[PDB]
């Protein structure tokens, strides 16, 4: 309950806009899968020169994240799988264009949370999202049938 | 697109921001500090070029303040680019097509920094946005006397059309009487430049004066029309108070 | 007082090193004009070429701060004003390279009614910060004699 | 030196602190992607000179990895700068001789890299950190065949001192059971070049060889390498709490 | 002044807001419920004379328009206090003397208050701000047909100059091209009276017409103005929104 | 799950009685149509005299309300309605008294985008319910045979 | 995790030198064997003759302190054995003068069920410490030779 009102006011300070507290909430420490209906809305808003640079700036903040919260990044490579699947054109060709914070990831890990290796979970995502960016015959073709 | 353009883009939505309120200066240094940092400034017209810009006419009179300062302010290449791109910043003088009292304004400035873009990539060797008195390209033109009179007859044509378009602003400002923020915020750049530009003429007149008449008396009414314009400024009870006197 | 029992929380949860703590205690909001001591602590730590990087790094959040900290960008300019008169060569090297982050200040502006009286110590600060570092006989000549 | 650089300094600091453990690889990623940010690396190896090394051999260990993964991962200029900066990364290998528990490994980083950029300056057309299949200078290097057979088999030999390197911490490491934490991660850059490596020649060896017979068995003993270092570094099952498991 | 006036004054600094957005319905909402609740008006009059009203046209063109709904909406003594005080109205069309265009919608829209107010004293025996089918007055108009007539064509004479100061602010609309906001919500209370005059002389028409020819006719101008109207109103993208129909 | 146990927290804070609590749980922005058993318990409370006062005192708060829960206004609205046809006499004798507080709604405006939708359910109800306090031979059939 | 923090919270609020936070954070419940390169620190810094108070006032505190932490007791006594060894002479002086507080623990005594384990640690360290102030060619000879 503290973190639900806590997380709520510091979306008041820092003044975030509605696509920002979107994808804030969608990327979030919250141990919840992201909701289909979530992912779908920030596809649906990628057609939108306005909103396409807050989502990808919230993201790119969220992909570079401190150890600490593994569970942003885990999501964050999650909603880009889905934007470059789903999204416009506009979220293949940045995310191609600086593809190397995600191949970077690639080697993430967080661990003696309580004992176990933590970066497992974002090293395969990363590693299967990296392969899809660089699949470009793989992604035009999944992207083509989606869309 | 790429990551580090997105903190400039963040600036750049504020700075034109969505009504007829001054360009916060915050914003603009934010812009003018990034193209100092990376050295170059493709991407701040790169961004302008993507930006919701013709959306309407409030903002678009808003990001040719915005991009002037930048101009002036930054690094050399927002100069260089603005050399490259003054066809761009020329169709944005059409986009509006001078109806409304506001879109008047939009195609004066537009005309302006056409003129002032042609200036330095048919004339000058120099490249910096406020004019400063460079000792070589002075040299250079003093030791080529007959350019050098076009050079101060030229500078003195963009100075003409500064003072011109100064007017507009005032006559749009009066007949308009109230909601006069981004207006006069479109003078602090004129202005700097107006001071600019006068402290170029003058170095370079006593220069070459002194190296060999009518400039003189040319330069009596350019000076006339400083004094006359800094005046005007003094009554503009907000724009008055930031810029330390207009000099 | 309890601003100064919070600011010593920040101080740690952000964890910044002593010679920063030092730096960001000296150009904090109290708003008594920054101490002769702490100054020329400061242009004596200026010669440690691994601890000086906290110093300007720490100056360089100070001058690029938000505008309702007008007093963080008046003391940051008068530390910097002293560092170039009786600190190391690096702080002027330095301050030289990056120019840019004070000579745009000139024309800055903050306003609560009567607040343009506050945008005026930036801005003579500012403007005789950059006629000292374009003034290279005053500055050699000055350097030479505070030395 | 200027205040975007502020931002890889702090990073390179946390790198190369006074624990023995590995670099964390959050601040490998932030000088990664700062190489990748700003198309241009010269700041890293400029940084790189100003830190004081050799003093406790900590520092010294750790950022021969940390400019080693740099090189590997890091926008093209990483290598180009590398290529230039040879003569210091010697002089690296120079300012601790003997004196230290490993300064043997000190050296045989500094051997390794020497030869490393050697290849890179010389015996491609390419210019990238992992080695991988460029299709241009693939289909050179079959046109131009025996300096393609020179090509892969000093690549080879580059590989025998890149597993000898292995071999030689290996034993390190079974001589450093008191306190082994980072001699696991001064593997990690060359496990992963291994097996980039290993594609690169066995795609170079099986075209160029159909296309134009004991270079098969030189390509098996290879093979076997690879086997060999996959069996020792799963041996020092620790360095899997760092890496993926290595493959 | 009483502190029960003070729970009114909050509301109405709020409803004269100081910019030209609209007029919010939750604050002239609050005036309307007060001047209910205290049975009478002078609270409301009261405050309007003392607010610092005449300090800019855009917010004495927001107090015309609260003004009107309060009176149209709301307890017949708003509408008696308003008869008595048609002067101080009057007197607010003088204090901008109809120089920049936003000070001509404000003298057009006096000289209506003013002719309503004038009718209302004048003519009626009836004391409602929208006008709605007063049956005794209706009967009593009829059994004296004369005057009948003279209340029809009289009351055709408030809806000529609804009509041409609908066009005033039309044709300002469409000159300044944007910022509506404020001008659409002028029109939002008459369309209301508007449609509420046409209902009286279509049922006073109705009657007298059954209790006995050309006013037919005039009817259909009158009409085809309310018709051509609400068109004109189903163009603004706004306004359209919150009347459920400009019916 | 959290909105419902500080609801339960300001309703002891602020000590609304049970018959409060009632309509203030009942016209609530949980926006579940409001339930069949509790309109015809208000119905038939508003015969007590002195409890009286509590339902209609909270409907007068709850049709007062800001703009932002336009749902409060809605299913006040809706509670009154239902009170005129099947409550007590008392609360028609009360809601004719003061009928502006409905009366003025019917212009009634809220906006997030869509939000227009929103200010429609409001204006229908509370011209239908004017329209019923209106017709009077309408609201005495009606009342007689609900009775 | 959070006693970590919790201690370094304590370490603000009661305003501890960073002498004292430096011994207060070496001899602490965190049971790792008391690093070589803080030994030697300590060392150093004792021949600082205002600062010398700051460790050795600490180190009382540590000596003093309650059963529960039997963990301060054992590394107090082994802070001050490498002190007498390799320390200034100020060290020594100090541990002659006051070395009752170390003699009396020779005795001492914890209990959790095998506790008395604990109390062994204690114990062997204070007896070989005293034996080490009381054989003084042993001191004089390990002095002269580690100096
Ligand atoms: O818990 P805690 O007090 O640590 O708050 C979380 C974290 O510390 C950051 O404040 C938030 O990330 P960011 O500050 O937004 O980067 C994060 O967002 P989200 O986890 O609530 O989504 C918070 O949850
Ligand atoms: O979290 P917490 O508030 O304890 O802060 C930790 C620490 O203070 C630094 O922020 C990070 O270490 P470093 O500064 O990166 O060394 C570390 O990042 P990560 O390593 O926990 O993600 C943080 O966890
Ligand atoms: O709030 P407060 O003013 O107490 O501190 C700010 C904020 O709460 C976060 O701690 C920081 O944001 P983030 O956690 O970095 O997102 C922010 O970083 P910075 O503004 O001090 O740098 C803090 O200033
Ligand atoms: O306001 P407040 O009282 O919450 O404290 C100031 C501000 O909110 C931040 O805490 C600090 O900003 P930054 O950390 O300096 O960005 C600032 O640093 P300093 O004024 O205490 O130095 C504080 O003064
Ligand atoms: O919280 P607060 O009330 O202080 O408002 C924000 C911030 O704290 C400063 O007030 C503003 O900075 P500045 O005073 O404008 O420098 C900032 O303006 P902008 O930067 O968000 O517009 C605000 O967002
Ligand atoms: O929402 P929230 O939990 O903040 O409760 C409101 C506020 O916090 C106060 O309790 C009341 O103001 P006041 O204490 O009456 O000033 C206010 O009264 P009312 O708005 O509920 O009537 C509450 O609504
Ligand atoms: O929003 P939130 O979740 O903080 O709770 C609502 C609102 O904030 C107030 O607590 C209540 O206002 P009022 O007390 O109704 O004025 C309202 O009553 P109800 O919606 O819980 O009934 C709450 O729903
Ligand atoms: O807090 P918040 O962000 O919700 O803003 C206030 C209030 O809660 C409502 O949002 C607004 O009421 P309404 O939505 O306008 O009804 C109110 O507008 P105004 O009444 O203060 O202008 C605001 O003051
Ligand atoms: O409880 P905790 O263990 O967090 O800290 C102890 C206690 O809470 C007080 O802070 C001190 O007592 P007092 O405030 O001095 O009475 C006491 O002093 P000392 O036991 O640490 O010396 C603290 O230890
Ligand atoms: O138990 P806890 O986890 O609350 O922390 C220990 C103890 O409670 C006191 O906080 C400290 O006692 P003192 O301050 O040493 O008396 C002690 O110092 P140090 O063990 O953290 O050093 C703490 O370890
Ligand atoms: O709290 P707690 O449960 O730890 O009990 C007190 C204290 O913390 C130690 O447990 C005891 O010290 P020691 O373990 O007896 O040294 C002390 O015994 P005494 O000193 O109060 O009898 C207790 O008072």
Redesign the interface.
């Given at each position: 309950?503290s973190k639900?009102?806590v997380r709520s006011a510091k979306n008041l300070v820092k003044g975030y806009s509605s696509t920002q507290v979107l994808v804030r909430n969608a990327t979030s420490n919250d141990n919840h899968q992201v909701s289909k209906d979530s992912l779908i809305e920030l596809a649906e808003k990628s057609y939108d020169?306005?909103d396409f640079?807050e989502i990808?700036?919230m993201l790119?903040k969220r992909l570079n994240d401190?150890?600490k919260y593994w569970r942003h990044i885990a999501k964050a490579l999650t909603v880009i799988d889905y934007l470059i699947r789903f999204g416009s054109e506009?979220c293949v060709?940045?995310c191609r264009?600086?593809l190397?914070?995600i191949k970077?990831?690639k080697?993430?890990?967080h661990?003696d949370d309580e004992g176990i290796?933590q970066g497992q979970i974002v090293?395969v995502k990363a590693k299967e999202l990296t392969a899809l960016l660089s699949d470009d015959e793989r992604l035009n073709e999944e992207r083509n049938m989606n869309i | 697109?790429?990551?580090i353009d997105?903190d400039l883009?963040?600036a750049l939505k504020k700075a034109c921001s969505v009504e007829e309120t001054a360009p916060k200066r915050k914003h603009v240094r934010a812009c003018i500090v990034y193209t100092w940092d990376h050295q170059s400034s493709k991407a701040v017209f790169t961004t302008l070029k993507?930006?919701?810009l013709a959306n309407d006419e409030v903002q678009l009179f808003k990001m040719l303040i915005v991009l002037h300062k930048i101009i002036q302010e930054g690094h050399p290449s927002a100069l260089a680019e603005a050399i490259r791109d003054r066809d761009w910043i020329r169709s944005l003088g059409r986009v509006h097509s001078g109806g409304s009292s506001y879109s008047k304004l939009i195609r004066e400035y537009v005309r302006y920094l056409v003129l002032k873009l042609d200036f330095h990539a048919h004339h000058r060797g120099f490249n910096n946005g406020t004019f400063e008195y460079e000792e070589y390209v002075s040299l250079v033109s003093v030791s080529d006397p007959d350019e050098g009179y076009e050079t101060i007859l030229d500078l003195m044509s963009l100075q003409d059309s500064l003072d011109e378009f100064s007017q507009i602003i005032f006559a749009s400002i009066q007949s308009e009487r109230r909601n006069t923020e981004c207006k006069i915020s479109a003078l602090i750049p004129l202005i700097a430049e107006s001071y600019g530009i006068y402290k170029f003429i003058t170095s370079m007149l006593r220069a070459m004066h002194r190296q060999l008449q009518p400039l003189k008396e040319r330069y009596e009414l350019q000076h006339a029309r400083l004094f006359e314009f800094y005046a005007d400024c003094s009554s503009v009870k907000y724009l008055t108070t930031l810029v330390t006197i207009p000099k």
């Open positions: 309950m639900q009102f020169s306005a640079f990808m700036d790119d401190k150890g506009n060709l940045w264009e600086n190397y914070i970077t990831l080697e993430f890990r661990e290796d090293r | 697109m790429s990551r997105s883009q963040k993507t930006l919701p």
